[PDB]
Amino acid sequence: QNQIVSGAAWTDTAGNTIQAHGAGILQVGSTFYWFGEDKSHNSALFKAVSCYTSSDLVNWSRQNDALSPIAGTMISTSNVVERPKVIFNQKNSEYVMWFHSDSSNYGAAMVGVATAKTPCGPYTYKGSFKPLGADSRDESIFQDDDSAQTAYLLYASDNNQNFKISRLDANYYNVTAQVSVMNGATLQAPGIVKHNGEYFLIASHTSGWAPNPNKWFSASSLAGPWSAQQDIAPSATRTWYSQNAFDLPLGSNAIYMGDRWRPSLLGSSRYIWYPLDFSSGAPQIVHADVWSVNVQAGTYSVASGTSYEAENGQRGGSSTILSGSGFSGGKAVGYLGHGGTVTINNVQSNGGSHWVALYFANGDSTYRNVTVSVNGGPSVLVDQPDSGGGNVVISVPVKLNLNSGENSITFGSGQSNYAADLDKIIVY
Ligand SMILES: *[C@@H]1O[C@H](CO)[C@@H](O[C@@H]2O[C@H](CO)[C@@H](O[C@@H]3O[C@H](CO)[C@@H](O)[C@H](O)[C@@H]3O)[C@H](O)[C@H]2NC(C)=O)[C@H](O)[C@H]1NC(C)=O
Ligand SMILES: OC[C@H]1O[C@@H](O[C@H]2[C@@H](O)[C@@H](CO)O[C@@H](O[C@@H]3[C@@H](O)[C@H](O)O[C@H](CO)[C@@H]3O)[C@@H]2O)[C@H](O)[C@@H](O)[C@H]1O
Ligand SMILES: *[C@@H]1O[C@H](CO)[C@@H](O)[C@H](O)[C@H]1NC(C)=O
Ligand SMILES: *[C@@H]1O[C@H](CO)[C@@H](O)[C@H](O)[C@H]1NC(C)=O
Ligand SMILES: OC[C@H]1O[C@@H](O)[C@H](O)[C@@H](O)[C@H]1O
Ligand SMILES: [Ca+2]
């Protein structure tokens, strides 16, 4: 049944908001382990490397925290611990965790290591350092599938200007040699997945918390040469408002796992997971608002839903129709909220709880929100991130309770702040 619904608030088996940002994924046997920053405290300072497990990548269960602060050290609560990655060391039968270990102004620019014999740990800190003497901020660990299972650190170096790939020693404890450097790449948030014997690097450019168009690069060796940057998503959408975290191989394709960073409320940062489809020979995000993964078969199924054009709705109050090449049908409804509404009618449904995808444009740099009322019911307030332009449409999901047969859905009523411009909705 379960569904990967990007943008919705995800909850563990305990009903608590998952707090595993900067995802790192490890698969011991039939269990998946998801590692991330715990951001419960709405701050970038360190609180925990969390630990969640699952058997099918949707139903997650929060274990003990795999790494926890230590006062007077550099994994203390005055420091920063980002993007935990974990591979398994066959030789030592040992789980080695890498992370970006830094100071609160990111001037320290180090890696940190920790080990444990249990996948979810807890892990003991072995210390932090500059890899081969150089800056390391955003990083990732690639485990090759050669016989030695050689591991590589991927990291943004020299104040994020030069992207580097270096080989890990046979213990995964330190870096033995450089392999590759892209000078002036200003790449961060890296991941690598190996597909058809070719290495694909995925990475953001550097733009603070602001999402930018993430890029793919390929090479037949980790040393290179690497292809020039290409898009994994439509450029205007800024990776569908997200930033790469982990790229997990899945059958003959992969899953793109990104974070939607909310700097002003970091705990509430969302998880953006999409099929990464290689049918063209290269990774492309499949913009699936709702989709399912069958891990055992390495397949994904993209749920198909029904589109309703916001402009075919019934406007109320001071809402308007707007025109733009970014809108589906060429139109959207503006001036929603602050006295303007639109009701979408004859939304057909077998009844129950249905994921509905609100397609909108938000030209501001800050969040808006919209009220959503089904058949005159009490409204839920749905968040609307900055979209990248009044002509750029991304989508957020809201789970709604419909009746069998004909429903209505009302946007913008009972809110004094303007909402974002509604392009359409897709009822799954
Ligand atoms: C729903 O979206 C609206 C905007 O679309 C959000 O309203 C904005 O809300 C913020 C925070 O509540 C307001 O901020 C503050 O303004 C006061 C003085 O006005 C200032 O002293 C504070 O430092 C802060 O900046 C902001 O005025 C408001 N802007 C607009 C245009 O409405 C609202 O917060 C969202 N609601 C939810 C539940 O997320
Ligand atoms: O804001 C913190 C947050 O955002 C990301 O990245 C930023 C930081 O890693 C930061 C560290 O100094 O560097 C940003 O990059 C600029 C660089 O692009 C510019 O040209 O020069 C300055 C030199 O001071 C700086 O290096 C980067 O955007 C991370 O993705 C996220 O995890 C978190 O750290
Ligand atoms: C976990 O989610 C999966 C959906 O694929 C399913 O087994 C069920 O809904 C959940 N199981 C439990 C025990 O909560
Ligand atoms: C790795 O080597 C660095 C030198 O850059 C050193 O500072 C650090 O302590 C070493 N750590 C381990 C675990 O070998
Ligand atoms: O500020 C009020 C207006 O702002 C515009 O940017 C938006 O496209 C309109 O639909 C309306 O919301
Ligand atoms: Ca439209």
Numbering used by the authors: 21 to 448
Paper lines:
The exo-β-1,3-galactanase is a glycoside hydrolase from the basidiomycete Phanerochaete chrysosporium (Pc1,3Gal43A), which specifically cleaves AGPs. In this context, exo-β-1,3-galactanase (EC 3.2.1.145) specifically cleaves the nonreducing end β-1,3–linked galactosyl linkage of β-1,3-galactans to release d-galactose (Gal). In this study, we solved the apo and liganded structures of Pc1,3Gal43A, which reveal a glycoside hydrolase family 43 subfamily 24 (GH43_sub24) catalytic domain together with a carbohydrate-binding module family 35 (CBM35) binding domain. The N-terminal catalytic domain consists of a five-bladed β-propeller (Gln21–Gly325), as in other GH clan-F enzymes, and the C-terminal domain (PcCBM35) takes a β-jellyroll fold (Thr326–Tyr448) structure, as in previously reported CBM35s.
The Gal3 molecule co-crystallized with the E208Q mutant occupies subsites −1, +1, and +2 of the catalytic site, from the nonreducing end to the reducing end. Gal−1 is located at the bottom of the catalytic cavity, and Gal+1 and Gal+2 extend linearly outwards. Gal−1 adopts a 1S3 skew boat conformation and interacts with many residues via hydrogen bonds and hydrophobic interactions. As shown in Fig. 2 (B and C), the C-2 hydroxyl group of Gal−1 forms hydrogen bonds with NH2 of Arg103 and with OE1 of Gln263 via water. Notably, Trp229 supports the flat C3-C4-C5-C6 structure of Gal−1, and Tyr126 recognizes the C-6 methylol and C-4 hydroxyl groups, whereas Glu102 recognizes the C-3 hydroxyl and C-4 hydroxyl groups. In Gal+1, the C-2 hydroxyl group forms a hydrogen bond with NE2 of Gln208 and N of Gly228, whereas O5 forms a hydrogen bond with ND2 of Asn180, and C-6 hydroxyl group forms a hydrogen bond with OD1 of Asn179 via water. In Gal+2, the C-2 and C-4 hydroxyl groups form hydrogen bonds with OG1 of Thr226 and ND2 of Asn180, respectively. The C-6 methylol group of Gal−1 is exposed to the solvent, so that the side chain can be accommodated externally. E208Q_Gal3 showed small movements of Trp229, but other structures showed much larger fluctuations. At the catalytic site, Gal−1 is anchored in the appropriate position, and Gal+2 appears to fluctuate in a planar fashion as it interacts with the surrounding residues.
